[PDB]
Symmetry: D2
Subunit: 346 residues, 4 copies
Amino acid sequence: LIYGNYLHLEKVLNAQELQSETKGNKIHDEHLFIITHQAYELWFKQILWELDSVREIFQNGHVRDERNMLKVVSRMHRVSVILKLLVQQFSILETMTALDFNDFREYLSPASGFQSLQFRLLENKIGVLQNMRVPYNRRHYRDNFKGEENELLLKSEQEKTLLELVEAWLERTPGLEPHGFNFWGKLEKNITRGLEEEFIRIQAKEESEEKEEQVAEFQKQKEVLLSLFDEKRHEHLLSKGERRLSYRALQGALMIYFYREEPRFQVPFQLLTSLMDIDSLMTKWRYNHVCMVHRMLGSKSGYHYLRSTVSDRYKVFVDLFNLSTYLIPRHWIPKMNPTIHKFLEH
Amino acid sequence: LIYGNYLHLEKVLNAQELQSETKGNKIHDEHLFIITHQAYELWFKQILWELDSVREIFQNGHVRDERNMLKVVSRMHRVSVILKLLVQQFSILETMTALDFNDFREYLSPASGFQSLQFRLLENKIGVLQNMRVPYNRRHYRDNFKGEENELLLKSEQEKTLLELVEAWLERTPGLEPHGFNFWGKLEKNITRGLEEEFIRIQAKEESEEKEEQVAEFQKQKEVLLSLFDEKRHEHLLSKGERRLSYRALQGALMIYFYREEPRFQVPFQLLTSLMDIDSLMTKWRYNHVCMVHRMLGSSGYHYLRSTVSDRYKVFVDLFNLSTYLIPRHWIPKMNPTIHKFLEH
Amino acid sequence: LIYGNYLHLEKVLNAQELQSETKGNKIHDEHLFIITHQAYELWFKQILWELDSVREIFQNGHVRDERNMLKVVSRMHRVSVILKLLVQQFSILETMTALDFNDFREYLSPASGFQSLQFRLLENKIGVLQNMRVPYNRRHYRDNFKGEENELLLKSEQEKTLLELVEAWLERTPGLEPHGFNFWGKLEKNITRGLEEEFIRIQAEESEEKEEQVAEFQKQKEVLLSLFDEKRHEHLLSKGERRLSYRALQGALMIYFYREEPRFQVPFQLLTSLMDIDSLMTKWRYNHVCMVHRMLGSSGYHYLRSTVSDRYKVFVDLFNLSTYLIPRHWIPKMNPTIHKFL
Amino acid sequence: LIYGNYLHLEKVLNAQELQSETKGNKIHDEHLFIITHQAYELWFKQILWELDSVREIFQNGHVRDERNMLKVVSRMHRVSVILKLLVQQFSILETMTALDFNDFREYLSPASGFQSLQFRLLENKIGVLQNMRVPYNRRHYRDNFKGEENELLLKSEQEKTLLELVEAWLERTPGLEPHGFNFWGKLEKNITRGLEEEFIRIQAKESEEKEEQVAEFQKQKEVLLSLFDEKRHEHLLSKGERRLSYRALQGALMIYFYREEPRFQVPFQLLTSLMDIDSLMTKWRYNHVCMVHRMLGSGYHYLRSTVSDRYKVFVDLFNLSTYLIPRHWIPKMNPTIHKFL
Ligand code: HEM
Ligand code: HEM
Ligand code: HEM
Ligand code: HEM
Ligand SMILES: Fc1ccc2c(-c3ccc4nnn(CCN5CCNCC5)c4c3)c[nH]c2c1
Ligand SMILES: Fc1ccc2c(-c3ccc4nnn(CCN5CCNCC5)c4c3)c[nH]c2c1
Ligand SMILES: Fc1ccc2c(-c3ccc4nnn(CCN5CCNCC5)c4c3)c[nH]c2c1
Ligand SMILES: Fc1ccc2c(-c3ccc4nnn(CCN5CCNCC5)c4c3)c[nH]c2c1
Ligand SMILES: C[C@](N)(Cc1c[nH]c2ccccc12)C(=O)O
Ligand SMILES: C[C@](N)(Cc1c[nH]c2ccccc12)C(=O)O
Ligand SMILES: C[C@](N)(Cc1c[nH]c2ccccc12)C(=O)O
Ligand SMILES: C[C@](N)(Cc1c[nH]c2ccccc12)C(=O)O
């Protein structure tokens, strides 16, 4: 067993055919463009491998055994460490000038990155919605794909996504039981009370621009906080695709946020953090890719379509980010005395 | 022409065979170990491509046309930007624990990174000298290689290296002509004079320990500076492999250092800078690789690898060491436009 | 001379007062928020130092001596290396959760990053135009400032910007002389010819492929010939959608196309670095936005989002020269006979 | 409350005095040298803040409540994220050439980085031992310091270090009870047995490969059984080739092997981050060395000496890789017997 055989370098290092050279006009920088993409694809394959393994742990019920949370968080962390490198890797392609790219661009048409099967598979498996995908020149993405490739794409759309598997798991989060710790009920009450207290305070002040300013802020804060308990408004925002998680999953997430220090919630909290990281880094990748298309082609547009992809429309875990909106004073958080805490001890 | 076909992904993405899985005991993290190395190898191929192209520009005489310096510096800069990423890429493999590596390590024997053809090609093409290589288990690196692989490795040793091609170019550096600007002559004189000036200054100082200290410093500095003009000392240090550039090439390098702002030397100065960067980053790569072997295998190969993290493997150590011979600006032989013109484009 | 004294650490390391602690409720992570910003400010001061030195080299005429180009490009490169680090530095503040930030946010009012004098000075000195700024809360940015600070900000708007100083230098680029190499004239002719030649080719099959190629030719011709429309340029200048004078634009394109010619090698690197600085400034604004979102939720967020736009790209014209790339063989030939001038 | 006042920028941004300018020969690049160091010092202060807060959580007994492990690991992770940036920050000073540094170097004498109080405080608070310090010609690293500065340095050496506080905590790791899961006993037995089983295998082999395997076996056997030699450990402790008590070492290995068990998941991450901090500290030392070399040529060798295991405080955690065994040799922890975890 030799290194080169183990790594099948007979394949990996015999995969560089410059179209410029095939058409009798070799252009040096084409080689860089080929290798950069091959490297992106190697790492996309590794991301798919980690992500598929984590999806499986959820789908098959292994995640139910909390012994497996360390593995889940390590692999999701690994996904983000890979993505950070993928973002840095753009700096290599920045060493190619547009004038140099212009010397071989002709020999590439009509190929495009759009045809990256694995990038699409990755978007789908995380949880990007087709309905929300931005049309490129009034066209569907899968239009450019055929055969078994079109097949794999379909499975990726139809199989349970990371978002859905996390949703299901969040729905079973301990503490939501109305007959138990009754998190949601206690939270509603504590916030309603606290708002009442606060209003009384402000109402006791004397008419002024200040008082109005405080009253106005209060009203805004009140509306945001109480909207959390409006299950119907949530259902509505779900159907418009401005939210992604079920109402119950949202309750589980908030439970984990507020009780993160409780032992059973420590690693779950880290998982939520890494899911947000993955969304952020995916968006950073899209951003750096856009900046590059611009530098090479100008405003001539793919640039604008790609710019549209840099939006909340492509953020699968938007709901986890938006739990910042619902931050309250610590003393309003339902108290969990050891009496009612033992259920969250390893 | 479709993306996947253009990039031959039918090969690149059908090259991942976990030996753990082939022997009926798939271990998840083996997949990462394979991909990481495949990625290193893709980028080694790219470095070889740039490096070979720059070597050719020198070997074929194209570098004589100063129009080509921009291309040479961009490609060498590109080599160092790739190497920066190769160093960061270790952080991916740091997400694998030793315990998890231990579950598939058995299925890897007897394969090793040592058998990386391209890493050897890269060391050779830059200019690592065989005689200065540290033996691993009392053997040449080029054993463990056979057939056309052994062939490629030979060519890489026998063809002109980047070190040799740079040396040749440095020897032709403008300004070294005794009949012209006579840089070396003027430099020797100006330093001899400046040292004299300095001695007088210190000798004037009131008897005091500071004076005593400064006397000591002066003596050391004087010895270092004058040793520059000792061509025989240089020949000796060449034999011991503590220097690699010819005496004349060293003169050319120092010319470019001191006159870097002069238009014809601006991009050449950047080239020298990038050559040092490449050596720095190669040794950072070796260092990070060692730290990783340690974390996975504990404290043999470790010690061999530790020996690789040394000036013995820095091809352009001479460019770094020109810091030793820095002088006050006012000692640098003057180049008024009168004697400037030869360095304007 | 001792390290601590040389670096005036008696000041730098006695500058951390947690407002949470001053009001009797110390919150651990406030310390990090203070240090992060102090570090950003140290680096902004260094950027200002390099940038002011480069502006001086232009304004005083030193740049006319081409021996100074290495210094100019090194310092501009150094600006972008600093900015790369400023972008990475956000990852430190990402270790603070929103819940933890929430515990000391109250004690910060009414202070904001908006009030960073140095950040504004930097925007102004590069060449961000006030009239092109996005209003904050329906008002001008400088209204948030007072006294000598408001005055410094004005000088920064009125004194020559890096954009203006580069523009002047670009205007004197060798080769534009109609009586000389006549770059613009030759270029117009060669593109007119080359377009025709393309037509002749495309004139010959009737497939959609042909139709597609014909379609491309149309815009390509439109884009390329629009380059020679000086009036359209003047119009886009007044709307602020371009920044450089028509002549400066000619100089830049001269440098792009002839970058390998010795006199243009380091100038080409300067143009590259100016684009880098714009790109990295934008990356900084982007990462800052992503972080405000993570800490505050969904709004300054929307104002900040508006700053991530071409409106704030001072050297947009250098980026846009990609639009006007032609085949190499169309580029006016400069044989050594004439190449000697460069 | 205004930004500049909140951040006391009247101090931070009025702290840049170029000695080149003070002596009538301003050198542009000196400004960068000053700011770079000031930035390093701001971040060293932040590292000290996090590290001191973590040391407190151990010393005051809060670490006993496992609810606090998330905070402990977050702050140690934060230390590493800062150090990663400190390593990247060298790339800024690499934009200064040695020729340009040479134009103001004279005006610095005799000041040196050696005089960084905070860097010393950081080394000490982690657990770098004075007795293990590499002498700089005349030793006396603390002798470069005086006054309340010399005072602070002393406290930093004498107060409990991160190493010592972690050691104490590792000693209380659940599972080491002889009357309980009896980790050490079971481990010794399982390895002794497994080695015997291996002997039979190699015995049944029948040329060279056998020779190869037998040789390896002997080495592996020696390494593994040396783990159970408490006296050898005590000896290596007194030399300074190990740092953790024998019992702490047992706790660490418990956490390594049972990392997936819920009570050990975050503790395992803590051990990982302690190793990370050691790694990154030594990366910092390495990049600093490479730069002194580029600027001065030939402290290079002294600084090179600092890049050694001699300066790795958590060397014991790294070295537990040496004692990896097959998974099936690890004492089994059935639900019944992992209830405690
Ligand atoms: C010279 C550098 C690059 C240029 C000029 C470029 C150009 C483009 C353009 C114009 C598009 C929009 C679709 C189209 O018009 O055909 C696009 C999309 C895409 N490119 Fe690139 N690209 C570059 C580098 C890369 C790299 C390094 C990757 C890495 C795999 C990549 C992957 C993609 C992907 C996946 C898409 C589809 C993204 C989406 O639809 O959201 N490209 N590229
Ligand atoms: C788990 C991670 C790794 C381990 C444990 C490891 C182990 C080793 C060891 C022990 C050696 C010395 C030769 C021997 O006895 O086998 C070696 C050398 C080498 N490794 Fe690695 N390695 C790792 C990762 C990598 C990676 C990511 C690369 C990337 C290509 C690589 C490339 C090499 C090369 C080229 C050599 C020969 C270097 C020289 O002779 O100076 N290794 N490795
Ligand atoms: C918790 C972290 C941060 C939050 C929540 C935050 C929040 C904000 C907000 C809301 C604004 C809009 C103005 C306002 O309404 O106050 C703003 C602007 C700004 N922040 Fe931050 N910021 C953070 C970190 C930073 C840091 C680390 C810097 C570093 C110097 C910074 C510099 C600025 C600057 C310069 C502006 C003005 C930007 C412009 O107008 O284009 N901020 N920030
Ligand atoms: C031009 C760049 C630098 C040079 C030439 C330089 C030079 C040196 C030298 C020669 C030493 C050994 C002690 C001595 O002989 O004085 C040293 C130690 C030290 N330097 Fe630097 N240094 C540089 C940059 C930095 C930076 C950026 C830091 C960041 C704070 C720093 C912090 C230190 C520290 C803490 C030590 C003592 C560490 C130890 O003893 O292991 N230096 N430096
Ligand atoms: F393997 C690859 C191959 C090509 C690319 C590109 C890319 C970037 C800029 C381009 N300008 N023209 N073309 C030709 C393609 N036509 C433009 C619109 N889309 C399809 C028709 C381009 C292709 C980006 N990544 C690639 C990967
Ligand atoms: F494609 C690959 C495959 C394997 C590696 C290794 C590597 C790392 C640690 C190891 N421990 N045992 N073995 C296997 C046997 N070795 C033979 C050479 N002398 C050391 C023992 C190892 C192989 C590093 N890079 C690789 C790349
Ligand atoms: F040195 C510093 C000090 C503070 C900050 C902030 C920041 C971040 C979030 C905030 N939420 N409320 N406030 C108070 C500011 N008022 C409301 C928002 N508009 C301005 C008036 C905030 C201030 C960001 N960077 C800072 C740096
Ligand atoms: F705030 C600061 C000030 C200075 C430094 C240095 C530094 C780097 C190179 C030097 N060469 N000579 N000197 C003067 C000091 N003498 C030689 C070295 N040992 C002590 C006597 C130097 C000082 C590094 N970091 C610094 C920080
Ligand atoms: C038994 C369980 N693992 C419980 C569970 C669900 N979601 C959680 C989030 C945090 C902590 C625990 C849970 C399961 O049902 O998967
Ligand atoms: C014409 C030339 N390339 C001169 C030359 C050689 N080395 C240099 C370094 C810097 C500047 C110029 C040169 C030659 O003789 O090859
Ligand atoms: C003499 C000159 N340096 C000419 C000049 C202007 N812009 C340029 C761009 C590239 C090369 C040269 C120039 C000057 O007038 O500044
Ligand atoms: C009660 C205890 N937290 C026990 C303890 C010590 N070390 C550990 C490691 C992992 C898990 C638990 C421990 C204490 O006394 O610290």
